[PDB]
Design a protein around this motif. Structure first.
Motif, PDB file in Angstrom:
ATOM      1  N   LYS A   1     -29.551  60.582  26.159  1.00  0.00           N
ATOM      2  CA  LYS A   1     -28.436  61.512  26.067  1.00  0.00           C
ATOM      3  C   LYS A   1     -28.508  62.405  24.842  1.00  0.00           C
ATOM      4  O   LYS A   1     -28.379  63.623  24.955  1.00  0.00           O
ATOM      5  CB  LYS A   1     -27.104  60.754  26.096  1.00  0.00           C
ATOM      6  N   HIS A   2     -28.741  61.823  23.674  1.00  0.00           N
ATOM      7  CA  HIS A   2     -28.810  62.637  22.467  1.00  0.00           C
ATOM      8  C   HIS A   2     -30.093  63.462  22.342  1.00  0.00           C
ATOM      9  O   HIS A   2     -30.072  64.571  21.794  1.00  0.00           O
ATOM     10  CB  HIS A   2     -28.609  61.760  21.225  1.00  0.00           C
TER      11      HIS A   2
ATOM     12  N   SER B   1     -29.633  66.507  24.521  1.00  0.00           N
ATOM     13  CA  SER B   1     -28.743  67.508  23.931  1.00  0.00           C
ATOM     14  C   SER B   1     -29.461  68.332  22.877  1.00  0.00           C
ATOM     15  O   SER B   1     -29.303  69.551  22.819  1.00  0.00           O
ATOM     16  CB  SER B   1     -27.518  66.855  23.291  1.00  0.00           C
ATOM     17  N   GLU B   2     -30.234  67.664  22.032  1.00  0.00           N
ATOM     18  CA  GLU B   2     -30.974  68.352  20.985  1.00  0.00           C
ATOM     19  C   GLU B   2     -32.046  69.251  21.600  1.00  0.00           C
ATOM     20  O   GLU B   2     -32.316  70.346  21.095  1.00  0.00           O
ATOM     21  CB  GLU B   2     -31.617  67.335  20.046  1.00  0.00           C
TER      22      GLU B   2
ATOM     23  N   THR C   1     -31.991  70.590  24.742  1.00  0.00           N
ATOM     24  CA  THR C   1     -31.299  71.685  25.389  1.00  0.00           C
ATOM     25  C   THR C   1     -30.835  72.716  24.367  1.00  0.00           C
ATOM     26  O   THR C   1     -31.027  73.906  24.547  1.00  0.00           O
ATOM     27  CB  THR C   1     -30.070  71.194  26.112  1.00  0.00           C
ATOM     28  N   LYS C   2     -30.227  72.235  23.295  1.00  0.00           N
ATOM     29  CA  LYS C   2     -29.716  73.094  22.241  1.00  0.00           C
ATOM     30  C   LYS C   2     -30.810  73.908  21.560  1.00  0.00           C
ATOM     31  O   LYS C   2     -30.597  75.060  21.195  1.00  0.00           O
ATOM     32  CB  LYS C   2     -28.975  72.236  21.208  1.00  0.00           C
TER      33      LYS C   2
END
Lengths: 86, 74, 92, 105, 100, 95, 86, 90
Positions: free
Chosen positions: A69-70, A73-74, A76-77
């Motif tokens: 999950k994290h 996110s990193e 994608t960001k």
DNA sequence: ATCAATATCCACCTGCAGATTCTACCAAAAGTGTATTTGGAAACTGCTCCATCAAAAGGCATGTTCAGCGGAATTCCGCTGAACATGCCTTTTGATGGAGCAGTTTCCAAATACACTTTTGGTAGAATCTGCAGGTGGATATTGAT
DNA sequence: ATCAATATCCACCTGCAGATTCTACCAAAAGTGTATTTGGAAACTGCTCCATCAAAAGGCATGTTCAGCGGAATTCCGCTGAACATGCCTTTTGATGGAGCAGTTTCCAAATACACTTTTGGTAGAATCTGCAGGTGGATATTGAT
């Protein structure tokens, strides 16, 4: 690069050369595992290109719940930010 | 997944005598097993943008769980 | 007798290759677990079968190790702690 | 110039990762986002382990991270322990752990 | 022409089309096809015998399983491999047999 | 409309017939043999790939296939598989 | 020229040192037969790894077994090792 | 009492527990029986030792669990054998 | 040892789900030939680091004595699995719309391939910096004897 | 339970090996900018084969009865290991010859890159064939009661 990240999380901490060598083995290991998964993923889908999309799926298949999950996110960001830079 | 089915599995495994509590213990293990495999299978499904889980998605999931299975493509 | 009838069962079932859980129940289980990962999914028939083949092959093999842990313990009943031991040593 | 790896906001080197991707023969082609994403993920994982190892160094009254700190941080974290379940960290030792039944009295 | 039943052309194509390396020498697919053919002959030979011993002319999964698990080396090669509809080897722990 | 599908089946048949001419094989069994050939192929190619990478080489030659085989195949599947491979390359070059 | 004969070097595992390893492994009591069983296990373990390590060495046409060779041999058999080069 | 003292002592330190020099021959010895005339980088010998000791320690943990399963506190050879059979080493 | 109730075997039988056989179409291969390119073997050799001998000394292996106590052997018996026959609720089998899995076409955002320009991360090496290993000593448990 | 014997904890201290810090060279990177090539998302669509339903099939839930497993309590033998004396052989600080790994340049056997032609393995619809799965019968081995 490992040293830069270290300073960000523990400004007042160093790292012995042996530990650094272990961190280097770790990054290379994770790189190969993620790329390997992306590679097979592309082939299974008759795709000749590895995009951020295969990398993302490779990360979901390889990492344990919360880390996935994290990581996602990193990732994608970073792509969104990278894509917005003219 | 019924007592008699779990018992049949145990028999093929050469098991002679079975404790009462085995049967809930087995179900728990089977569930953890399926969860793990299906999670991956479904991840290959979504990646290919399908709504149908294919044998190959299952085969690929089994393989990188280290449970290679012969007979269903690949 | 008790355990006797067991023995003939081992003989029989070993030497069949048929599946040992019933299909519909197994299918419902597979679908239920999948629904938690992504809704409104369909399954190729061969997909559920691959799942059932791998699941039963997995369980049979685990029961072999469980048995070794039981007998290691000078028992003939397998208990839950036998399964746990086997899985822990397996790294599962 | 700017380098990519500011473009993406990313300590880890996007350029090198894109190259290593190419030279590893993982596909015919490698999209431009792939290396950005992968570098982000690698940076995230090393941040996670270093956060934890740095803490272990702190609990052992040390300023310098050593292999034992990396091992303690990994084995004490469920997920990192799982991701590295088949990995051996040289000079890391083990977690202290004595089975209940072995204690006296 | 390499004296094989297996397809060298296909293997070569597969070797390339698999991103295993930048280039693929001419001898590689020949060598690889020969290895695959040999191993294939090895299992069929044993599976065939397994069928004869059961008075059957057609090899089925059961026969592939018996052949593999009864051969130390094939069994090693295929230790993390499951064969569908193969069943297991007849085997009961001594300590579990009747008191006699 | 095509959508058609290569498989090692024919050449597994063939082989079957040299080893046992009077024996047949069921469909499900052929599918197992196909999985078997693909699995061995990917395992051998993968290790050869790593081998070339390790030694910073761009080419996968019969030499890599040989080392891959010695790494992957047990003692005496290796011995025979190696000779079979050498024999085919020899009977290929000399031709 | 040179060369002493190497033999019975298995006996080097100094059946303390076997004791010490068992302590790290959390073992409290050790049966007298454990020492020979362990030497046998250590022998098989080393044979398999060195066999592969040496196979990588020969393939590269070297006379020297490198840390990389061992690292690669260890990964082959799913005992990945960090920190000795990567 | 002494045993527990030793477990705590070793479970925490990180140094190799087998003598260096002795370990390093029966690397050479075993290697020699495979192929003669081999040399070893010193770090190759150290990698083998780090790996062998990690493997043995983890094996004793499992062995320990097998003895305890049998309601014992002495590990015997059959515990090591059960552990390896389950690990599919065996 | 003597039946009595079953389970297991084997030889024979045959219907059919699944395997074999023949024909015809064709995109996708695989083989062949020409032209261009290049990976990596060979020959030369710089220079790292592996093997090895030397010598000193104390960390640690070895071998013995002797007692603590774990674990196998044995008897006892509580109570849990398992055999078995009763009854039907669930799974299995075969018939049917329709959701998608795919096969095909289009075409543009995005990935090569190519020529330069410029920022950077190694590193060989002399020099300063600093965390902590390791020896020391004494306050604080943790044990074992009584 | 108060005591004595010991091991462990722990903060303070300092020589020093390993590490954070340069000044300088730079080949290998990585970045910038057209020009050319194309992989695969997107829209549309036909044929699968998947989800659903009803009727036929057969495996499972259930309560009684009791064989017999395996944990509890008891016992004592003989192995394991703590303590201790002795002294070997590993460890450590050094230095040296030179094997052999690895950097650099040369150059051709072998691989890539189209372009053109022949063959072939896979798919689809039809017809025909057959290994063996269940089914029956009758023999006889196996198991449990006496």
């Amino acid at each position: 690069y490992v040293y830069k990240v270290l300073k960000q999380v523990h400004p007042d901490t160093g790292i012995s050369s042996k530990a650094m060598s272990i961190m280097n083995s770790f990054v290379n290991d994770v790189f190969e595992r993620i790329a390997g998964e992306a590679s097979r993923l592309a082939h299974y889908n008759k795709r000749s290109t590895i995009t951020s999309r295969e990398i993302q799926t490779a990360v979901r298949l390889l990492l344990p719940g919360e880390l996935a999950k994290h990581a996602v996110s990193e990732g994608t960001k970073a792509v969104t930010k990278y894509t917005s830079a003219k | 997944i019924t007592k008699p089915a779990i018992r049949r599995l145990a028999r093929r495994g050469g098991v002679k005598r079975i404790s009462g509590l085995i049967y809930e213990e087995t179900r728990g293990v089977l569930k953890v097993f399926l969860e793990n495999v299906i999670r991956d299978a479904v991840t290959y499904t979504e990646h290919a943008k399908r709504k149908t889980v294919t044998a190959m998605d299952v085969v690929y999931a089994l393989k990188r769980q280290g449970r290679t299975l012969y007979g269903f493509g690949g | 007798r008790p355990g006797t009838v067991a023995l003939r069962e081992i003989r029989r079932y070993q030497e069949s290759t048929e599946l040992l859980i019933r299909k519909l129940p197994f299918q419902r289980l597979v679908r239920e677990i999948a629904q938690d990962f992504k809704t409104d999914l369909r399954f190729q028939s061969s997909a559920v079968m691959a799942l059932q083949e791998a699941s039963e092959a997995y369980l049979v093999a685990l029961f072999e190790d469980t048995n070794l842990c039981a007998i290691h313990a000078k028992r003939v009943t397998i208990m839950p702690k036998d399964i746990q031991l086997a899985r822990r040593i397996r790294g599962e | 110039a700017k380098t990519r790896s500011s473009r993406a906001g990313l300590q880890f080197p996007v350029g090198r990762v894109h190259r290593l991707l190419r030279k590893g023969n993982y596909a015919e082609r490698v999209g431009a986002g792939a290396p950005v994403y992968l570098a982000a993920v690698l940076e995230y994982l090393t941040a996670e382990i270093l956060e934890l190892a740095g803490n272990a160094a702190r609990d052992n009254k040390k300023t310098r991270i050593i292999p034992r700190h990396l091992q303690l941080a990994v084995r004490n974290d469920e997920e990192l322990n799982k991701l590295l379940g088949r990995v051996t960290i040289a000079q890391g030792g083990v977690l202290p752990n004595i089975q209940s039944v072995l204690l006296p009295k």
